[PDB]
């Protein structure tokens with residue numbers, strides 16, 4: 307039976323990182339807002355292809371991402387800038403759209419969070 311890959315890295319001493327104000331915002335506004343939402347749960351951790359019985363998941367999805375991972379990265383100050391974080395978010399939503407057919411419960415869930423994600427992003431502060 308097929309196994310899961312290791313999750314994405316959340317700490318990496320080689321990688322350059324910063325704490326910006328835009329990045330403070332990405333956890334305090336953007337992630338807080340999504341994490342609490344009723345449709346967040348499928349995205350709070352890596353997709354478990356073994357227990358969900360999705361042996362094709364990690365054949366089709368080559369760059370997995372999830373909010374648990376993004377959360378741990380924000381907390382460990384893993385990022386250099388806001389765009390890196392923002393990119394993880396768009397990878398998460400996109401992976402969901404790529405794997406699942408449109409109109410699926412899980413797509414609707416990704417769509418809702420995404421909206422919230424964009425409403426909180428649009429008022430990203432100026433780099434201070």
Ligand SMILES: Cc1noc2c1-c1sc(C)c(C)c1C(c1ccc(Cl)cc1)=N[C@H]2CC(N)=O
Nearest residue numbers: 347348349353354358360401402405406411412
């Ligand atoms: C993220 C993500 N992307 O795809 C999937 C996920 C996850 S994570 C997780 C814990 C579950 C239950 C799923 C669901 C899913 C299916 C229906 C509803 Cl209401 C909510 C999630 N669907 C799988 C795909 C599949 N066909 O099972």
